[PDB]
Ligand binder design. Structure first.
Ligand code: HEC
Ligand code: HEM
Ligand code: HEM
Ligand SMILES: [Ca+2]
Ligand SMILES: [Cl-]
Ligand SMILES: [Fe+3]
Lengths: 225, 213, 449, 142
């Protein structure tokens, strides 16, 4: 089974360098062009360039000619990409993929296997733990069959954050929204809907974990008055 | 460079139906066009290459044709796992170039959002901040509009929105809107409204509260 | 004897088909490095079977030529039936051209169908791509020929040269019968396939070559027949003592038992001997001679052949004949390299040698040609010969590089077939070059009369 | 050293080794049924050896290292195309998509073979791959 293993998320400051890897397995690594494709959110894919581990040759899109450096190490069946003079534009997901045909002369073909992607986040931000606020329905009144609660996780960096209700025991009726940037920092929210009988009667706690700052906080949703 | 335009950019359909999507090249790529399927938590999958060739292992419900500058992908009878993102790539010339995508969404019956409003928490207030949060849950179709009103009067900025992708269980959508003020801006007003506008009604859904009580 | 003249058609035709063979070579040459060249019209495997069958067919014409010429002299006889020579010339050449047109004109599977390969399937085996009727044709031609030239031998004199050539030709047609025997078992098929290809080429074809050389050495030198024939028998003795069990070097990887690895390598390592003894044969007996032959091209040919054969069959056969070495080299550009220098060195060359000797007197021009026609012939010689050595050089290079990149490293470390072919590209180009220098070389030679 | 002792070494040396060779071919032709797994050599594989011959695969490919050197070794292609279980299905696709039409690339003919024929062809090649070739080829690449 032909597989490509890419390295993990990297964070960097503007004007820095990062170097990511793509570990090949289950085919003859020196026989296939390895291609690298960039994807920024709602931007569509662009082809960065390719290395041919067979003879070490490379080919760059002009758009990237100075930004990217590709190399390979045959012994380890791994290919490598280096990005330099990092700007914000460079924050994106980066994929490696294998030409679906073998050989040096098919330089521009389609790909049959992709890696899962390596996220590069470029930022001047500093690691900052989230503030976690519990969100409880407009001052406690007799309402419908359903009740909705929320949890606001505010002002952190970098991503990700993991959130759960009741340590994972409440799984459905949850919506956890994508984080979004406010200035340097991310913020995120999650809502849970539950039968009106269930709470305040029973107990609902929002569980937030932000591994970058080694925080874990729990906020119990507390009826207003 | 040769550039690629995909159309439509998104498309709704139902299991069982047939859909067809488009890919145009700024100049002749001859027969060399490929399509990939993108799904969350799965690596991208080659479907067809050279315009019309099924790649190994792909169900024959998929097919594609075209030459020169105009191409299509077709799915004979849609299957649940076919709702996904579809990209085309030209494999005629250096440098390789991709279309920007077509999103094939699972169609469902219209659903109005459930709207819920939340005042700033006690904790947030005591740190100087005030975030008013509004959820708009489980609606379809995806287009929706949120207005914040403070004491009757629209509120343009301090507002931040987030959307979920189409839920894979019930096929609906969700959205959160957060209006962030300072404790001071917040206490200088009384009523906070969040208004949702969605095709399921001509009149907006309106949730509000008065800061006093 | 005035019925030696029936050799001319066979010689002319052999040279006609030889020009073809080369042309179809050059096509394949180009296809290596331009993969779609002449596609779909003429796929690689079609150009190949044409290149491949013409080589074999034209050599067979040269062989019948040689036999028709030298046999009457040796028997001290008129050739049994000079008409049957002339009629069996048209049957063979017809069936030749016809089967070559079969290949080009109909998709191969269609040709199997068209010729009723269904009933008696013999097609689609290497060197044996000719339909079952095409083969039948070649047997009748061969049987008429054996009878014809054999009757001549039976009445009038037995010479060592006569007998050996005969034994060679009988051996050729007999072993050709296995080309009608096509087992459903792959290994059994392969096992018997070599009874044709190898026992021809390192077996009975060596007696045809030995006796032809031995005859030419008799006439152009004047050295005693007693000594020439004595040497001859030594040559063929060594050929078969090593050759017979030497078949084993094709028996390593087809799925016959392991003891062939031992048997095959040991017996093969002695297979260079006949060819080296043929070098000594020609050098030593051209060395001490009674007369100065008015045709100095024959002596060139005679020597070049033993040298080329030795290098090609001898040295190049030896490089890869050893089981632990062939294991890595089996079915690679090394193989095409050896295949070429040995076929050209021993067989093309031996044929051109006897044509050099016998054509002048076959046309009534005399012993030799005008000194203007001799200098072309040797320009012809050298170009072909030297082009070929370059060809095999380039190919061995492609070969070692192939074994290097493809065969030696472990799973995952080794290059894929297509990938490694891309690396070989420059060698494939230089080989085309060398092939062009060879065509030019052939043309030169043909124009030398 | 006469012409006679030469002629006799020729005769006897020859007639000795022909007999020793027939002896070894007899011994070898008894060995095959188990070496090649003839019991598993079915009508399908035999019907495939026919497709292989009729279409001259050998004119571009090598089978167990013998044939043309223009295209890959097919004795062990099974191991390069998702193995035993999926090979027949692969070969169906593989035969139908030819020629691939990549500019400059060595090209494979369209043979227009029926589903049935490609299935026999696939059995042929699977069988071929499981012959004991004394560990040939060196690796997965042929
Ligand atoms: C030359 C005119 C060919 C003939 C005749 C046949 N094949 Fe072929 N084959 C050829 C090429 C140039 C290639 C590789 C092309 C590429 O772009 O990769 C192939 C490949 C195959 C394969 C795949 C081998 C691999 O290593 O993956 C198979 C299984 C195959 N061919 C089968 C095959 C059969 C069954 C044939 C007779 C019907 C046949 N080929 C003929 C070139 C040529
Ligand atoms: C005498 C004239 C010879 C000719 C015309 C000749 C020709 C050839 C040809 C055409 C092939 C390729 C066969 C094929 O299509 O598979 C071949 C292969 C081979 N030859 Fe010869 N050969 C000659 C002599 C010899 C000799 C003397 C030796 C031993 C020293 C030898 C050893 C080999 C071996 C071991 C192979 C197998 C190649 C492989 O495994 O890929 N040959 N020869
Ligand atoms: C003149 C230029 C020539 C070219 C470009 C050429 C090319 C080729 C090619 C490409 C092949 C097939 C390779 C493959 O199977 O993949 C081949 C086969 C062969 N050619 Fe030639 N050839 C030339 C001349 C000759 C000559 C003069 C001879 C005379 C003996 C010769 C003898 C053979 C033989 C025996 C094979 C069999 C292949 C084998 O079994 O290894 N060729 N040739
Ligand atoms: Ca061969
Ligand atoms: Cl041989
Ligand atoms: Fe041999």
């Amino acid at each position: 089974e032909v597989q490509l293993q890419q390295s993990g998320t990297v964070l960097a400051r503007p004007g820095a360098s990062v170097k990511m890897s793509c570990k090949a397995s289950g085919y003859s690594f020196t026989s296939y062009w390895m291609h690298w494709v960039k994807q920024r959110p709602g931007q569509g894919l662009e082809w960065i360039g390719a290395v041919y581990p067979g003879n070490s040759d490379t080919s760059y899109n002009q758009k990237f000619k100075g930004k990217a450096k590709l190399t390979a190490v045959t012994s380890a069946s791994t290919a490598y990409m280096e990005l330099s003079s990092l700007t914000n534009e460079d924050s994106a997901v980066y994929y490696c993929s294998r030409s679906s045909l073998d050989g040096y002369y098919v330089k521009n073909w389609c790909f049959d296997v992709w890696g899962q992607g390596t996220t590069v986040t470029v930022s001047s931000a500093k690691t900052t733990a989230p503030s976690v606020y519990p969100l409880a329905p407009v001052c406690g009144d007799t309402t419908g069959s359903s009740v909705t609660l929320g949890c606001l996780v505010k002002g952190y960096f970098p991503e990700p954050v993991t959130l759960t209700w009741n340590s994972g025991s409440l799984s459905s009726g949850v919506h956890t929204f994508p984080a979004v940037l406010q200035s340097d920092l991310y913020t995120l929210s999650s809502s849970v809907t539950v039968t009106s009988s269930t709470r305040p009667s029973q107990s609902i706690t929002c569980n937030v974990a932000h591994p970058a700052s080694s925080t874990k906080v729990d906020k119990k949703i507390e009826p207003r008055g | 460079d040769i550039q690629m335009t995909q159309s439509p950019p998104y498309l709704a359909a139902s299991p069982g139906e047939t859909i067809t999507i488009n890919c145009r090249a700024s100049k002749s790529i001859r027969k060399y066009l490929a399509w990939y399927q993108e799904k969350p938590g799965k690596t991208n999958k080659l479907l067809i290459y050279s315009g019309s060739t099924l790649q190994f292992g792909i169900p024959s419900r998929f097919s594609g044709s075209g030459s020169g500058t105009e191409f299509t992908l077709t799915i004979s009878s849609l299957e649940p796992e076919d709702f996904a993102m579809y990209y085309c790539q030209q494999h005629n010339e250096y440098p390789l170039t991709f279309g920007a995508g077509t999103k094939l969404e699972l169609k469902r019956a219209d659903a109005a959002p459930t709207v819920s409003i939340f005042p700033p928490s006690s904790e947030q207030l005591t740190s100087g901040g005030a975030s008013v949060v509004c959820f708009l849950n489980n609606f379809y179709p995806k287009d929706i509009n949120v207005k914040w009103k403070i004491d009757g009067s629209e509120r343009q900025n301090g507002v931040l929105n987030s959307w979920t992708d189409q839920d894979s269980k019930d096929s609906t959508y969700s959205m959160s809107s957060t209006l962030t003020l300072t404790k001071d801006e917040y206490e200088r007003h009384n009523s906070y409204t969040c208004e949702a506008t969605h095709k399921t009604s001509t009149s907006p859904i309106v949730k509000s509260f008065n800061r006093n009580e | 004897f005035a019925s030696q003249a029936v050799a001319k058609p066979y010689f002319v035709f052999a040279l006609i088909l030889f020009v073809g063979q080369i042309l179809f070579g050059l096509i394949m040459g180009l296809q290596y490095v331009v993969g779609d060249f002449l596609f779909p019209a003429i796929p690689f495997n079609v150009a190949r079977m044409v290149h491949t069958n013409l080589l074999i067919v034209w050599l067979l014409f040269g062989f019948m030529g040689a036999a028709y010429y030298l046999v009457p002299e040796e028997s001290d006889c008129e050739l049994y039936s000079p008409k049957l020579a002339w009629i069996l010339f048209w049957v063979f050449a017809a069936a030749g051209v016809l089967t070559i047109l079969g290949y080009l004109l109909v998709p191969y599977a269609g040709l199997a169908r068209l010729t009723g390969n269904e009933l008696w399937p013999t097609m689609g085996r290497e060197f044996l791509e000719q339909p079952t009727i095409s083969k039948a044709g070649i047997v009748i031609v061969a049987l008429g020929f054996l009878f014809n030239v054999g009757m001549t031998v039976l009445r009038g004199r037995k010479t060592a040269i006569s007998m050996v050539l005969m034994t060679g030709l009988i051996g050729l047609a007999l072993l050709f019968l296995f080309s009608f025997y096509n087992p459903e078992n792959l290994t059994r098929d392969k096992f018997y396939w070599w009874w044709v290809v190898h026992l021809w080429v390192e077996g009975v074809w060596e007696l045809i070559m030995g006796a032809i050389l031995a005859f030419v050495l008799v006439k152009i030198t004047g050295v005693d027949r007693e000594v020439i024939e004595k040497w001859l028998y030594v040559i063929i003795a060594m050929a078969l003592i090593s050759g017979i069990i030497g078949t084993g070097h094709h028996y390593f990887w087809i799925g016959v038992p392991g003891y062939w690895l031992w048997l095959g390598s040991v017996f093969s390592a002695l297979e260079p001997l006949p060819f080296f003894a043929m070098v000594l044969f020609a050098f030593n007996t051209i060395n001490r001679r009674r007369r100065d032959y008015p045709n100095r091209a024959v002596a060139l040919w005679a020597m070049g052949t033993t040298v080329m054969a030795f290098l090609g069959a001898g040295v190049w056969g030896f490089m890869h004949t050893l089981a632990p070495v062939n294991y890595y080299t089996h079915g690679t550009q090394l193989t095409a390299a050896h295949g070429h220098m040995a076929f050209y060195g021993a067989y093309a060359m031996i044929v051109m040698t006897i044509i050099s000797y016998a054509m002048p007197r076959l046309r009534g021009i005399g012993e030799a040609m005008d000194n203007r026609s001799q200098v072309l012939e040797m320009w012809g010689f050298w170009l072909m010969t030297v082009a070929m050595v370059f060809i095999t050089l380039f190919l061995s290079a492609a070969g070692v590089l192939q074994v290097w990149l493809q065969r030696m490293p472990a799973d995952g470390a080794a290059m894929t077939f297509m990938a490694t072919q891309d690396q070989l590209a420059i060698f494939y180009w230089l080989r085309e070059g060398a092939g062009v220098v060879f065509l030019i070389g052939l043309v030169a030679y043909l124009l030398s009369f | 050293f006469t012409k006679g002792m030469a002629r006799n070494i020729y005769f006897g040396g020859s007639v000795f080794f022909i007999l020793l060779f027939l002896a070894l071919t007899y011994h070898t032709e008894k060995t095959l049924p188990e070496r090649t797994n003839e019991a598993a050599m079915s009508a399908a594989v035999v019907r495939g050896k026919l497709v292989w011959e009729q279409n001259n695969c050998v004119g571009c490919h090598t089978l167990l290292g013998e044939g043309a050197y223009f295209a890959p070794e097919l004795g062990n292609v099974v191991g390069r195309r998702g193995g035993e279980e999926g090979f027949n299905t692969f070969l169906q696709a593989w035969m139908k998509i030819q020629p691939l039409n990549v500019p400059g690339r060595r090209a494979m003919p369209q043979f227009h073979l029926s589903e049935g024929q490609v299935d026999d062809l696939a059995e042929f090649l699977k069988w071929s791959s499981k012959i004991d070739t004394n560990q040939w080829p060196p690796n997965k690449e042929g």
